[PDB]
Amino acid sequence: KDTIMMILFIIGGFTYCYHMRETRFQLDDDFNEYVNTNKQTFRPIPDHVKL
Amino acid sequence: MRVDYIVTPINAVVSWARQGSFWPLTFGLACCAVEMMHATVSRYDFDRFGVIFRATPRQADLILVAGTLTNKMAPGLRRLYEQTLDPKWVLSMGSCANGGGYYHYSYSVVRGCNRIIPVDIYVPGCPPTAEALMFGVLQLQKSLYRQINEGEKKYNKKDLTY
Amino acid sequence: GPLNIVFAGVAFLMFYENNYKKLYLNPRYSYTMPYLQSAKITKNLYEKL
Amino acid sequence: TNFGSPFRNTDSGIVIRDPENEKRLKLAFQNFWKSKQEDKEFQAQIKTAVSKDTVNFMFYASPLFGALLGKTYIDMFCNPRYFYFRAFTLSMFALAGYCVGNGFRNRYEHSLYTRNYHLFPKDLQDALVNGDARYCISWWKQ
Amino acid sequence: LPWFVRWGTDVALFFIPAYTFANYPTTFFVFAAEKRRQRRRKDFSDVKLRDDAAFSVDQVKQLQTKLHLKQ
Amino acid sequence: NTAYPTPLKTILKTTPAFVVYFVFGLGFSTVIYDVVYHPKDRIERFYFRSSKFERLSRKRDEKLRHYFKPAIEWQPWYNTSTNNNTRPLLRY
Amino acid sequence: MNTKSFEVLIHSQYAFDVCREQVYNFEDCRQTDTPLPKDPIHCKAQAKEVLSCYKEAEKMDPICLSSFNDSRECMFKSDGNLYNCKTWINQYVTCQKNPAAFAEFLEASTAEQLKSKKFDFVKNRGHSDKYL
Amino acid sequence: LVSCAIFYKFIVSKISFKNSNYKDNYFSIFSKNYLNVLFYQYWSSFFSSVMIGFCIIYLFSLTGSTEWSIINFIVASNNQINYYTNNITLLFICLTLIIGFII
Amino acid sequence: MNRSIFQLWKPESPRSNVNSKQIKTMNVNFGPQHPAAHGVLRLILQLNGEIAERFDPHIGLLHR
Amino acid sequence: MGDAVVIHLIQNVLIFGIIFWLLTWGAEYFYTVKQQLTKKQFYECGFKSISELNIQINFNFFMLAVFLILYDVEFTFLFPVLFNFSMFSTTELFLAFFFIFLILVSLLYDWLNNVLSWSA
Amino acid sequence: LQMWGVGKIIEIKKFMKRRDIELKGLQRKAAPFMQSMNDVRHLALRERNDMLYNELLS
Amino acid sequence: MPYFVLLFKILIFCVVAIATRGTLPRYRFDQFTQLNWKHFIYIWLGFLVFNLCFVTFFI
Amino acid sequence: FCLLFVLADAWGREKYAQPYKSQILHGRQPFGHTFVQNYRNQATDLGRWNHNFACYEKQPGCGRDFD
Amino acid sequence: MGFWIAPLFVNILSLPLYLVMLVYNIVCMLLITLVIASITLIERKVLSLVQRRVGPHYVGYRGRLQYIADALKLFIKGIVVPEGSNKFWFVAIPSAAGAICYTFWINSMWGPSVSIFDLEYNLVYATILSILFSFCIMLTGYFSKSKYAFMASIRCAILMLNIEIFLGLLVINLIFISESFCFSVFVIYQEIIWLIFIFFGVSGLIFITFLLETNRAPFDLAEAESELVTGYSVEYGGFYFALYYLGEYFHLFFFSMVISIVLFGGWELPNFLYLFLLNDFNIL
Amino acid sequence: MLTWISFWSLIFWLILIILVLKPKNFISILFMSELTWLALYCLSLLFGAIYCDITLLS
Amino acid sequence: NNNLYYILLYIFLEIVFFGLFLCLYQLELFTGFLWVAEFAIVFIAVVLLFYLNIDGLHLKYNHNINNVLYYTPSLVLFLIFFNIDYFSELELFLPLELSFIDIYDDYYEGFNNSIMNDFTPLTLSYYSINSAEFIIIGLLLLLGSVACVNLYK
Ligand SMILES: CCCCCCCCCCCCCCCCCC(=O)OC[C@H](COP(=O)([O-])OCC[N+](C)(C)C)OC(=O)CCCCCCCCCCCCCCCCC
Numbered sequence A: 001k002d003t004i005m006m007i008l009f010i011i012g013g014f015t016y017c018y019h020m021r022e023t024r025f026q027l028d029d030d031f032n033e034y035v036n037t038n039k040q041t042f043r044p045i046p047d048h049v050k051l
Numbered sequence B: 001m002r003v004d005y006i007v008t009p010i011n012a013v014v015s016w017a018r019q020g021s022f023w024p025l026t027f028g029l030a031c032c033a034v035e036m037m038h039a040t041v042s043r044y045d046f047d048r049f050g051v052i053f054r055a056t057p058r059q060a061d062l063i064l065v066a067g068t069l070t071n072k073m074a075p076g077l078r079r080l081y082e083q084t085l086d087p088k089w090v091l092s093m094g095s096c097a098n099g100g101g102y103y104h105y106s107y108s109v110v111r112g113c114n115r116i117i118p119v120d121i122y123v124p125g126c127p128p129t130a131e132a133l134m135f136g137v138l139q140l141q142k143s144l145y146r147q148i149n150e151g152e153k154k155y156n157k158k159d160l161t162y
Numbered sequence C: 001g002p003l004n005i006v007f008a009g010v011a012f013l014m015f016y017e018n019n020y021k022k023l024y025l026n027p028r029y030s031y032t033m034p035y036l037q038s039a040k041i042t043k044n045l046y047e048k049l
Numbered sequence D: 001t002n003f004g005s006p007f008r009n010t011d012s013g014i015v016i017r018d019p020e021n022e023k024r025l026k027l028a029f030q031n032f033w034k035s036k037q038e039d040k041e042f043q044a045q046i047k048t049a050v051s052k053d054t055v056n057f058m059f060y061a062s063p064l065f066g067a068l069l070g071k072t073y074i075d076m077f078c079n080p081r082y083f084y085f086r087a088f089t090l091s092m093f094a095l096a097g098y099c100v101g102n103g104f105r106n107r108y109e110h111s112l113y114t115r116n117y118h119l120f121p122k123d124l125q126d127a128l129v130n131g132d133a134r135y136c137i138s139w140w141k142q
Numbered sequence E: 001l002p003w004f005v006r007w008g009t010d011v012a013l014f015f016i017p018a019y020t021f022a023n024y025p026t027t028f029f030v031f032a033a034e035k036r037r038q039r040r041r042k043d044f045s046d047v048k049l050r051d052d053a054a055f056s057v058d059q060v061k062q063l064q065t066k067l068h069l070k071q
Numbered sequence F: 001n002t003a004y005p006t007p008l009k010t011i012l013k014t015t016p017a018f019v020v021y022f023v024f025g026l027g028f029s030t031v032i033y034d035v036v037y038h039p040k041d042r043i044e045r046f047y048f049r050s051s052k053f054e055r056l057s058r059k060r061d062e063k064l065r066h067y068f069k070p071a072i073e074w075q076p077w078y079n080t081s082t083n084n085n086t087r088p089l090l091r092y
Numbered sequence G: 001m002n003t004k005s006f007e008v009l010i011h012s013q014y015a016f017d018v019c020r021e022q023v024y025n026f027e028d029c030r031q032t033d034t035p036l037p038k039d040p041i042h043c044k045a046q047a048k049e050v051l052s053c054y055k056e057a058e059k060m061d062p063i064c065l066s067s068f069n070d071s072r073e074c075m076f077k078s079d080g081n082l083y084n085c086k087t088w089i090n091q092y093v094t095c096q097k098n099p100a101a102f103a104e105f106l107e108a109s110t111a112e113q114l115k116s117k118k119f120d121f122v123k124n125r126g127h128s129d130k131y132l
Numbered sequence H: 001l002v003s004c005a006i007f008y009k010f011i012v013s014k015i016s017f018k019n020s021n022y023k024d025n026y027f028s029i030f031s032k033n034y035l036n037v038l039f040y041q042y043w044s045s046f047f048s049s050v051m052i053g054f055c056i057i058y059l060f061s062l063t064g065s066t067e068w069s070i071i072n073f074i075v076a077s078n079n080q081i082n083y084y085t086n087n088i089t090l091l092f093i094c095l096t097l098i099i100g101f102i103i
Numbered sequence I: 001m002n003r004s005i006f007q008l009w010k011p012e013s014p015r016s017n018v019n020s021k022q023i024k025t026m027n028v029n030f031g032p033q034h035p036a037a038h039g040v041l042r043l044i045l046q047l048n049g050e051i052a053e054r055f056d057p058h059i060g061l062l063h064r
Numbered sequence J: 001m002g003d004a005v006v007i008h009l010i011q012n013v014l015i016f017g018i019i020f021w022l023l024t025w026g027a028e029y030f031y032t033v034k035q036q037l038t039k040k041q042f043y044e045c046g047f048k049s050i051s052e053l054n055i056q057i058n059f060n061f062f063m064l065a066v067f068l069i070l071y072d073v074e075f076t077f078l079f080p081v082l083f084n085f086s087m088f089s090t091t092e093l094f095l096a097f098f099f100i101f102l103i104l105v106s107l108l109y110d111w112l113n114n115v116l117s118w119s120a
Numbered sequence K: 001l002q003m004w005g006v007g008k009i010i011e012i013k014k015f016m017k018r019r020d021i022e023l024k025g026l027q028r029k030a031a032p033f034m035q036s037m038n039d040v041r042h043l044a045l046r047e048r049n050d051m052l053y054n055e056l057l058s
Numbered sequence L: 001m002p003y004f005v006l007l008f009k010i011l012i013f014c015v016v017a018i019a020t021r022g023t024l025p026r027y028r029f030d031q032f033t034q035l036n037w038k039h040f041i042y043i044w045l046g047f048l049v050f051n052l053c054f055v056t057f058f059i
Numbered sequence M: 001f002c003l004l005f006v007l008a009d010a011w012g013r014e015k016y017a018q019p020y021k022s023q024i025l026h027g028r029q030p031f032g033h034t035f036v037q038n039y040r041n042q043a044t045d046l047g048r049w050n051h052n053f054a055c056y057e058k059q060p061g062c063g064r065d066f067d
Numbered sequence N: 001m002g003f004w005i006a007p008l009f010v011n012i013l014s015l016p017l018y019l020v021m022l023v024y025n026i027v028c029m030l031l032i033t034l035v036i037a038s039i040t041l042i043e044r045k046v047l048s049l050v051q052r053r054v055g056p057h058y059v060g061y062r063g064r065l066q067y068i069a070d071a072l073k074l075f076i077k078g079i080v081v082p083e084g085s086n087k088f089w090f091v092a093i094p095s096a097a098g099a100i101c102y103t104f105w106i107n108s109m110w111g112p113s114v115s116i117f118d119l120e121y122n123l124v125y126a127t128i129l130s131i132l133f134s135f136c137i138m139l140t141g142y143f144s145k146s147k148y149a150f151m152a153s154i155r156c157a158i159l160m161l162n163i164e165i166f167l168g169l170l171v172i173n174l175i176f177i178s179e180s181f182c183f184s185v186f187v188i189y190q191e192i193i194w195l196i197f198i199f200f201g202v203s204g205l206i207f208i209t210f211l212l213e214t215n216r217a218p219f220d221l222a223e224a225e226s227e228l229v230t231g232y233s234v235e236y237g238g239f240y241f242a243l244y245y246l247g248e249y250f251h252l253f254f255f256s257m258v259i260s261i262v263l264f265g266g267w268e269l270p271n272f273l274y275l276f277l278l279n280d281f282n283i284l
Numbered sequence O: 001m002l003t004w005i006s007f008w009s010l011i012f013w014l015i016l017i018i019l020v021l022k023p024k025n026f027i028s029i030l031f032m033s034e035l036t037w038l039a040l041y042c043l044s045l046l047f048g049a050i051y052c053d054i055t056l057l058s
Numbered sequence P: 001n002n003n004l005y006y007i008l009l010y011i012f013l014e015i016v017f018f019g020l021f022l023c024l025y026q027l028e029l030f031t032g033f034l035w036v037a038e039f040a041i042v043f044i045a046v047v048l049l050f051y052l053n054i055d056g057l058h059l060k061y062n063h064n065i066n067n068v069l070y071y072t073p074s075l076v077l078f079l080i081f082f083n084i085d086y087f088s089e090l091e092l093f094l095p096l097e098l099s100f101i102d103i104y105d106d107y108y109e110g111f112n113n114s115i116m117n118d119f120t121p122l123t124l125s126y127y128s129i130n131s132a133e134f135i136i137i138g139l140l141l142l143l144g145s146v147a148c149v150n151l152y153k
């Protein structure tokens, strides 16, 4: 009984780590959307910079 | 004369310190050794009076002879006494050490440890109870505290020593 | 001796020349010589101490 | 808090504990939310990584799930004669579940107030970023 | 008097002086630090002022006096 | 009778030693802080604790004061003949 | 040009927000195909332009002096951590954009907002500051 | 790497043998061949390695790389250009490499 | 788990230098004034890397 | 690392040692030392020592020092990837894991050959 | 616990990364004027050395 | 000031060491050397590998 | 076992967005690394190098600036 | 005239400043010595509890000056150098040991950027100082010409090999998180939770590291009173022996500081005790 | 009083000369060989700094 | 000096002075590493002496004969003719005020730089460019351990 409960307990912890990694991804998207609010312009490289 | 103004107070500070940390040598012969080890444990705490045991004579302040001394051990006891750092004091514990004791009429026993090394104090029993050993150690501590200034110098007309 | 006197003179002139060129003929904007430069608070980037 | 404000360092050099300022900020943002409550384009423009109903369900279920786990744990791991350690175990499990649910709503709150940052006006944006009620004066004063 | 009252009194007598000492490493010298901080502030003569000023220097003085900004 | 519990009374013997240890440790820490806090009117952060841009801004004025003014005001007879001049910023 | 570095950054926030054209010209001049920089002598003139527009950027309205001094004290106490003092700096720039509207701003302060502010970044450490 | 492998090979040589010499029991006979092999291989490897590292350092200093093509191109172009006219350094580099390989 | 028996013991052979004692043994007095020697034990101890090889217990220092 | 203040602090440490030296010299006024036969001789549990200079250890654990020399190099080579692990890629990760695997394999070989103990 | 703690450390690191993006933006705002002053001073020193070298070598 | 709190923790680690001195017996050098070189190094390296794997998972 | 697990999860991570794919398979190097390892690189032809913003013009988000 | 005598005072006017710097350091040294003394007394008292006795109770009032008495007596004791030993080395190794042990206090951190020096490689400095002290101990054991002391020196060599490997592995594992050698960088990561949460599986190994670096009961080799009379101070008494235990207790104190900084939150309160009731963010 | 490049080249070759000079005791030669490797270490670092090359630190 | 202990001590002091030069020339990090490594080695060396030369007694050698026969004139000739320093000047060759490149700062990669330690070049070389030599040194250490075990056997 103890060993099967331990087996069941190790699993779910991996599930919770998966969930918290996904929440980290969500927070990263949230902050990206916040920070790109007033930074929507791009200046092209001038033609005098050759290839 | 003026030097005493500094020396006389400082003397006390020198005595107090050496009275507050009186480290005997870890050395026990026969069964006064067992009684001494009883005198060291929590029932009678020498550590209360700042008495802790050091294993080497170079860090010891008191030599505690606590057992029978044979003719085979006398040179070793003499060497151990000589190899202790000054100043040092010697305590003789029990009958076998104070005199011959229960083996005074034997062919291989030194008739008292004071035939080999000087002795500062004697504890008479066989064995002297931990009560008596603590009494003797406290007496020796008080004596060595008072021993730095026993009034050897004379006072001049200014109440100053020499 | 005379040569010892000459050496002492040259050493003293070297010491005084170094000190004189550190104290004067040199901008004083950083604290290098204590008790001879000002120890005030500067509000601008370039203030003479 | 564990991380503080997402837009600034909370107590970096000086600690400010001004309940009036935070009450003003909350009132101004509630007024803004209520004013733009019935415009369908603004309602449809709101985006958040997790819905509100799922957040409510998670907060309602996580402490109950933890309490059930603790009850099972004491029932088939602890002697029923005693009473103190079992109560402590249920308290710990329920607190862990409540922590998970509070984490759900806190992440929802963060996403709500940081994904719709461009919808707020300039004064509201400044008040939110700097945590100062003096920027959007007109929102909370009247 | 309960025993824990006396124990708490002793603990407070130990803890308050230590906490106070840890709070102020520069004992009896924080006033000099406050004076230095006050002198570090720039007056109106230490900066270049904008000529087209909405509020004059005196007007800012009365504003600060009235607002109790305490700067 | 309102005596202390027996387990508490035994451990209370070591408390004055803890108090004197705390006094000495607080003194040591306070002296370290005060010695650090005197020359810099604040507790200066470590130079390596800042970003690359911050490192340039914190040392720009010192560079200008110590290596720019003596170089832009240099004259041939300004230097000492004893050859004990200021050392370069980078040692080669 | 004779001002200190932290003051330069504090002014530079508002200056970059106002001196956009000269900054754009300077940045376009200094562009290169390598992370290695260009010769500064090739972009001196535009650089001068930038400095010129910075000069009038430094001149400030009297009502912004309190915010400027608070930002300066924060900068000095933090040893040039701009993010840790980005709040007060913002309060400065919002003044420089509109000196007239700032007065009502200063009238909205609470009791604690009207107190002299002392920064001690050792006793108060913020929340997970990487540069501390 | 290969020199360490060769040292490992030299180490695991058989030392004692089963022979028909029954006169050497209860007497000490010293061979000393194993020690000489290990000693000389060890010190020759040391000398060669230090001199090769020295040459590598100066080749980076002179050219900026130890690639064969870059080194050859740089040396030939310098011969054509007459830019680096330190014959002593080139002679010493060549000498050190050659002597390291000789050892 | 392989055999390490040869690393464990070292015999002696007549006139064999590699089988003899190739070291000066540490001859120590486990003498009476030692904490582990009790009171009067004077044990002549031969140590080789803190391994006890030869014992010579001198007793009679408390023979009365 | 440090700065020029370290040498000055070492000199200050030497001055503090001078303070202790002065205290110890002053303490000599309160005792006398009498010359005796065995007082200045080696102490060996109360009897006379039979050796002075030739006190040689067996050093039957040199393989431990041999392996320590190599694994110190192992770990000092391991530091940079740990310091800059935030910028890892396929190559860095593969190299780090291969290096750690080689260390483990070497330790396993040592354990198999039983060179991690005391020998006669 | 080891897995959860590693995840937490990664969380604080990502939060610091976001703050670092913001600080980098502020530093970008500050950069051009610092660059202009640096270039002007560098060119002043270079012009001094150029005129000195020309006078010496002419 | 922070160091106050620090002192507390230091004191704790002083008390634990004294209690360990009063409680535990003493090893032999060879025994602990064998334990370290045959058991603990592998545990340290495995812990390092686990930490690296977890960081790669989460980063 | 941890290695097999982490590589399996890294390969399964491909279902996420580009910034959240596994760094084991996607590179996130600093600007010096990126420039030197992608300079004159035709396999990953990233175009011209932006100097003020140290990124290649074909990299997403290169040269982001305030409006 | 003053204008022509100011140069002469350029250098000597800086002479007092150096002096006062020395004074400051002296004070610090004294203070740290004092706290170490207190720890000594603390030890005895704590031991008394485990043994159910009183401990020092009669030196001063209720045993308040035991460490002072011990230090003064150790000063008073008169040292003798045996013949057959090198007198120069016999007196020089203790001096070097004291000078080394009175340096550990520069590798200390009390709050962010509060150390006396701006050192960055704190762990490297700790390793250097530890190996220097081990050098001193081994040389003391060798030059004492005593068999027991020299066996203890060999034991110290074995101990330092073991601690080199063991602490190197611990430092390798710890660097992976902080990415720095400085002490102040671990606290910013430990503000939320302590690193023992990650290192829970190797808590026994961490405690072993603490004991091994401190030379506590399971690893009290080179000072054992049973196998040896005394570890390395068999022929040493007076203030050389005092210097050696001063160094040992300095090692105790500063490694306890190091462990507390790098694994137990440093100078942060145990916030994890309320980990279930803390919000990650506050916005409004 | 001597340039670092010439100083360190001469130091390396002098170390080799002294290694050859001293009486042939194996431990002495081992110690001198270690010193030779350390001199190479220092020279490589010096040239790596002078020429801005990252391979010499390696 | 022919005493092994004094040779070891003087080599230890030489290592200290090498680290001091690295510190002066502003390669601080490489002073921190070198020392500790060699320090450990020196420690082990001392133990080796305790096994192989317990007393400082050494071979009774006379250094004068070889000095006056071979080493002095060879050293004189080598010093006379050996110099592989093409161009490099002391810091006092020209006035310091004529140098200006240490003052220049480029702030655009200052805010584009995310590095916070000094291990970046070592990381680049060991795990990007010279990774082949890194693998070679690892294999070399493994083979050396195997060879050491076989030598012990
Ligand atoms: C030599 C045995 C093996 C050594 C292995 C490596 C040891 C590394 C260092 C460990 C510590 C012990 C060394 C320091 C003390 C002895 C000094 C010494 O060796 O002198 C020999 C040298 C030479 O020894 P000598 O003078 O006996 O030799 C005469 C010449 N022959 C060899 C021909 C016989 O001593 C001197 O030159 C005179 C004494 C000078 C002592 C100066 C320092 C004294 C101690 C001050 C405190 C320590 C330094 C500061 C603190 C540490 C840094 C923060």
Ligand code: SF4
Residues within 6 Å of the ligand: B029, B030, B031, B032, B033, B066, B067, B068, B093, B094, B095, B096, B097, B101, B102, B125, B126, B127, B128
């Ligand atoms: S005097 Fe008596 S009791 Fe004491 S040790 Fe002698 S025999 Fe034993």
